[PDB]
Amino acid sequence: RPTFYRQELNKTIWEVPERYQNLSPVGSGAYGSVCAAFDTKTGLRVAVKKLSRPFQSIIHAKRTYRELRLLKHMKHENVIGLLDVFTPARSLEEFNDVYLVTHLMGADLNNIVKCQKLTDDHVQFLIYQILRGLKYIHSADIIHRDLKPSNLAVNEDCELKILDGGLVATRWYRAPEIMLNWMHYNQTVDIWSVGCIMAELLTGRTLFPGTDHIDQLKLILRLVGTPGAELLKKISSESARNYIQSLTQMPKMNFANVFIGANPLAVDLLEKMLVLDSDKRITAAQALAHAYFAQYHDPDDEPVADPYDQSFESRDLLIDEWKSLTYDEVISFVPPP
């Protein structure tokens, strides 16, 4: 058990091991406040996040546990990972706070696209890193479900990590089937998001800046064209169907005419990501082997994950059960190399 010290930072008492120093609040991020701190053990600067009311409710408690499980599991260069987790509590009876420690990040993808104008070499490397991490995530049977610029960290060296949550409307990046509340959707919902992000990186503009979920569908159909017979057959919702069939057909634009001036190989990959039919959407693994990434692809350096047990997602438990499970996970944490 490390030696802890206490400190009032704006709002609350922070209690952290003496190994973490010069704590300096950097804002409210990804449900809980975050200080940057100096890790005297490694000589590196880090982010320490104190979770906000981790056990306020069944909902909060289960998400504290979800988030500890996920962050403990992710071990990959392009996905946020866990350097440390701790609590000042010494016993389950005292257990109220959870602190998570990760690399200090600084900027998200949104911060980058907003100043500069990205060259093709940059889009290749950013997208490559997204897909590489997404292959890993997908191979755990996890679907991210919220890929968007503010959930992607990018340092000064243009190295990227997929985030659990923000350091940019979700709707702009959401697969059309989620927008129609279609159940059973597969991994490829993330591949659609990656297509929207890629398009934005090439053009400087949000691909489909919808004002609500209906507008969003309009904008999406302007680009890809009204669904073919084979796809309407699958809809079920009669209002979705009448909505899609109403308005004058505006069928498939020429991606080449929309991305005029982008590398033709980027246009081709885009067409394969941004397919309505999620059955026919290119996978993270397939996309990695697309000639667009010939400069970066290495099939022996694109690793997959240990299978992730997410059955707990299928339980309704008591707050003290969720809290006891999280407690076991704090206690059993093994720090990285």
Ligand SMILES: CCCCCCCCO[C@@H]1O[C@H](CO)[C@@H](O)[C@H](O)[C@H]1O
């Ligand atoms: C833009 C308005 C039309 C959107 C049509 C969305 C096509 C989605 O694709 C569909 O996804 C389903 C759920 O994963 C699968 O069950 C279907 O097989 C698949 O074709």
